[PDB]
Amino acid sequence: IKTKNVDAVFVEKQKKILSFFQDVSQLNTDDEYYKIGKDYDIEMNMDNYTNKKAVEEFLKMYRTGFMPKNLEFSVFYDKMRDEAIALFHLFYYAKDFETFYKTACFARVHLNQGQFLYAFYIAVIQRSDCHGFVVPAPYEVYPKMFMNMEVLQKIYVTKMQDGLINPEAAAKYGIHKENDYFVYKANYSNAVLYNNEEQRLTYFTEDIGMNAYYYYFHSHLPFWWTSEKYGALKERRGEVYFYFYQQLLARYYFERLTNGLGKIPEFSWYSPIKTGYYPLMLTKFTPFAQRPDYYNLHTEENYERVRFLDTYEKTFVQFLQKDHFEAFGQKIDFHDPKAINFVGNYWQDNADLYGEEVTKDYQRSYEVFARRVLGAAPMPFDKYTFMPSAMDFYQTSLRDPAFYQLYNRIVEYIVEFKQYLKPYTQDKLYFDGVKITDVKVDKLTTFFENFEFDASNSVYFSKEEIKNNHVHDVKVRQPRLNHSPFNVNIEVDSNVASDAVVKIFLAPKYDDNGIPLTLEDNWMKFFELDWFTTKLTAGQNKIIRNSNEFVIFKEDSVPMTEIMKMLDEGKVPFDMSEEFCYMPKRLMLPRGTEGGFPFQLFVFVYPFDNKGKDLAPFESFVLDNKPLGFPLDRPVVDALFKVPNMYFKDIFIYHEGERFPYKFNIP
Amino acid sequence: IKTKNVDAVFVEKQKKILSFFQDVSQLNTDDEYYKIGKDYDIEMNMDNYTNKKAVEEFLKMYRTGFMPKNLEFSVFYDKMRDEAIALFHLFYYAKDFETFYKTACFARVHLNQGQFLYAFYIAVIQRSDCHGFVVPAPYEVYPKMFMNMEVLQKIYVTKMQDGLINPEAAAKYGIHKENDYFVYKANYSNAVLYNNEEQRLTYFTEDIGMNAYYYYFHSHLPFWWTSEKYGALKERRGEVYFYFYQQLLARYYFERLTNGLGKIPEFSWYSPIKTGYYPLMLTKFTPFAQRPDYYNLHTEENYERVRFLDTYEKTFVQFLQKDHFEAFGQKIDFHDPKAINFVGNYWQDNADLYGEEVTKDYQRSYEVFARRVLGAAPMPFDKYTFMPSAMDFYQTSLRDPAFYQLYNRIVEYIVEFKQYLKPYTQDKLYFDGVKITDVKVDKLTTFFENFEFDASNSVYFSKEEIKNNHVHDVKVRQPRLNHSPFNVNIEVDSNVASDAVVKIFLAPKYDDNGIPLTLEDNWMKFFELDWFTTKLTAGQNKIIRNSNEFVIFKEDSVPMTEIMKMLDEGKVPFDMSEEFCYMPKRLMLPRGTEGGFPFQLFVFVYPFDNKGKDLAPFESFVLDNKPLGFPLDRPVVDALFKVPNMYFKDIFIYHEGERFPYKFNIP
Lengths: 667, 667
Ligand code: NA
Ligand code: NA
What we know:
Chains A, B: GO terms for molecular function: nutrient reservoir activity. Chains A, B: It holds the Pfam family Hemocyanin_M. Chains A, B: One of its GO terms (cellular component) is extracellular space. Chains A, B: This is Arylphorin. Chain A folds into three domains: 232 residues, no CATH class; 233 residues, di-copper center containing domain from catechol oxidase, CATH 1.10.1280.10; 202 residues, Immunoglobulin-like, CATH 2.60.40. Chain A starts with a strand and ends in a 12-residue tail after the last strand. In chain A, strands 2-3-10-9-19-18-12-13 form an eight-stranded mixed β-sheet. In chain A, strands 8-11-14 form a three-stranded antiparallel β-sheet, with no helix packed on it. In chain A, strands 1-16 form a two-stranded antiparallel ribbon. By secondary structure, chain A is α+β, with helices and mostly antiparallel strands. Chain A has 23 helices and 19 strands. In chain A, a hairpin with a 2-residue loop joins β2 and β3. At the A-B interface, α13 of A face α13 of B. Bound molecules: sodium ion (NA) (2 copies). The site of one sodium ion has 5 residues of chain B, from α16.
């Protein structure tokens, strides 16, 4: 739908990129990438990389040996990570497109496909020549990680059988051929297993968009890499960390509310953890590890891990006990809101915490080991051989209740810091002579709709079938949440011509007992929907803002084949070219109820720095230096806070149509 | 066997020394030491001590009162320790031999014998005039701590009875008279009790040599005393600590392997500990404390102790979290391998950790309290009255599985530091133009053989019997492990005349599942056998090294009576005069199996600093400043490591003869 135009030169480059996301598990020896790949000599091309040191390091490490082709790559393990990072450096410091391309061809040919794709996807994102380029949605690149094993197996069965043996029989199982695609209907995990109440939320926690979303978040801004590239953004890194989780968690909490599930559970490393996770997914070697209910974190195997983790926390508790201290070669003062940077970087243990370009093995990650122990897997066999859990991958992390429980813990500690900050005062927040006299919102209505994604990358083909470009294409379809578009009409009385910023937040109305929600202690349950600017004339004004224009969300990724068609028309998708790392639009609202679950909308209008000139979106945010999530980035005091340029509207989220996703999947 | 010659002046002094290790529990009032002892006045002789402050402190403390004669001294308790240290200062700062001697005479006469012997043994070792002198093996001085109570009681019975009542009946019990010695055959603890699998290792963990060995290690270099005396060695103290345990533990792990017992168990102070220890030993007041299986460390009595211990560890975890920090008035950087000193001193909490000559009560020992809580004894009655456990003494410490579990924990934390160090590079380790083309090793064969030790010091005599120099002498005999001597023939191709160092390590082949062992993660399971130097000529060379010449081990101590005979022949034992603090030779190999348990030998040849001059052993090590355990003192990367001057030979440890020690002790 929303597109953008592109010259034949961009087209050739884009198709070259996408060729690496096409048949990922296998090698076409006839194909151009293979000829290039097989014999390409990095050493002879040394002067075609910006950074000799990087390439040397790569050749060293590579001649030493990388991970093998049959294993499962995860970034959370040292040696694999380092291999990946070196490969990435290689892609990144390539002189030009051509060399980068030749470098990929090599790596595709010579290396573990998981490692390669991790590296490449990030390089494409992070390279400056490649800004403007497009990467396929992660569920197409790694489809095996966006579906339960039931479906995956059905796919393999159908392929072994070279088609359906009894079409009518297959239809009972949600399998049918549609033109030259085989289509699998896919149920969420709780259609087959309801082990605890968390399964109530599967349509969210398993939603291929939510998971892809987290995968983008990491890809844009990996914990091991410095934010150097982004210049000024670097000094805000910590801020972005906290914001991302605090937002995600708020959105998650909304889902919880509408399923009658309340606040996110706390755990202790010295105690068993009540909430299990039974992953219904596997790998060519092993199944993902399961965590039974009341799994005891404190066993022989974890004793040392727990020590480390306990210390990592106690250390931050000590920071909170002083207000000003020296850590990691910086001098920190918790009265300073800019210290959020340090705090965010502390918890993520990222490159910017130290002054470095990449993290080092001895700089041990709290998140890595939290994930590792929460994951409940047995100890890895060797460095390349471990039992995967959902927290070994960004594609799968959102699937485990424990994920939210972990980041909840971290975020909470970060707000323990936020308490140091002076609450915004009356006269910091006032917009003199402007008043929001009314807010009116359209119908807020959620629903489910079937969605298909191309899952072909999961299918293995034959020597003979590959040269024949024989087609066995696979689509997986499942109900995914969506909502109807809606308008927010804001009526404001500006005394005077002024330029304003309008901000829109969604928040809960009551807690799960009907206690109405007070800002004083519920400010962090506010989810930001929109940020925009408006000319405000004297007298009466009215802004109309449509949920499609909301800046914080994106449209669904277009499939590769569709992107591929658009390229022949000098076209490319807009949203995928620029706006990929945002939350998908359909998920903005939690699942409402047939009778209208109560939330509230917080509209806030405040003075914009004129510019004296015309305005464009991206730099317009950077010109006003308000902290992310303003004015709800720190504790509020209700009475000191409320003001005429604020408005709170009680709203109701309805749901229409079929309420349970499995009803779509009925034979 | 290996002896050395000595003038009549040394002889008189040596016999004077040994007279204090002769009848230790009783006083001969007719004897010369007593006459001297009883009336000797320290105050009047004040000007015969180097250090007035020391002697004053002694007289103060002594007039206050020392520990009583009937109790059991341990160095791990404050007040007793301080008394000991003061006594030691007195012995140490004596002007000359004569005064030192007069000082001992006094202390023997006036003080607790345990305290006295602890003090004296160390003073003899540490005094410069006394270098060259010889101390009896600890199992002769403290025989009660090198045998189970069954045997001790048999000794007392036979003495009360003034001999054997029915020789034939006694023979059933492993008791018989042999000339004028009464001989007791002694079984290891598991012949009478197999409470858990650790009992499989008793022939090692109870071996009187291994235990004596640890006792020497402490005596040479007590945690409470500065390494000032040893000059340059002081800056290496921490290094020696880690090395000693890391070596001992490796040797221990070997024993584990050949008994099918695997890796050393981890514990938690907040959890019960699975491995019990049932000491079969006692004291004139009480039995040693027992730790049942699944003994809970976390009870009211230990709550505070655990806090302290937990903190002591968390503190080091924090050091690891920074790489560079200030602690104990030093600035530490963990990228610097010399920081090992600080690290070793941190864990031992020794005098050199602070800048001091002796430790102070307020400088609370991690090892002391770890020992105390692991020991499972109830809380001491008063300062001189406690229930002993095997970890209250260096003579007994090796007997408890918990000992290895403790030092394992510590060592592991220290290798967590070792990860900071940059792995030796290809060109640090290469020996250009030299190549080990072959290694061939003789038959590696272990066996048991009966060993006797004079245990007479455990026998109480009569007023009448003492003046009559009536003889009731006691020998304890038990099978102890040994092995056949063997040659390592190393074939090397030196391009050129060079001087080299050869090093020999013993290491495991597989883990307990048959996974072959990779240096990357098994470097710390390498046990160093030999360090020597060789002229290497151009063309083909071959070094032949015999296990007797291996520098790291020693021959068995000669008994006092035998030493006593040698003195009448202007002779003294060589090994006991210089080489006492080394591991006994017989234990170098773990117990093999009748069919050949697999290990491997690592030979490594590297360039020696010419000297331009002739070479002697002790300073030849100090001229090349390679860290202890080079090249295996830090993590290795297999591929970066291997080199032509290295060689790895698969080897097999056979065992011959009777496999179980109890079969020697059969009536
Ligand atoms: Na939590
Ligand atoms: Na341990």
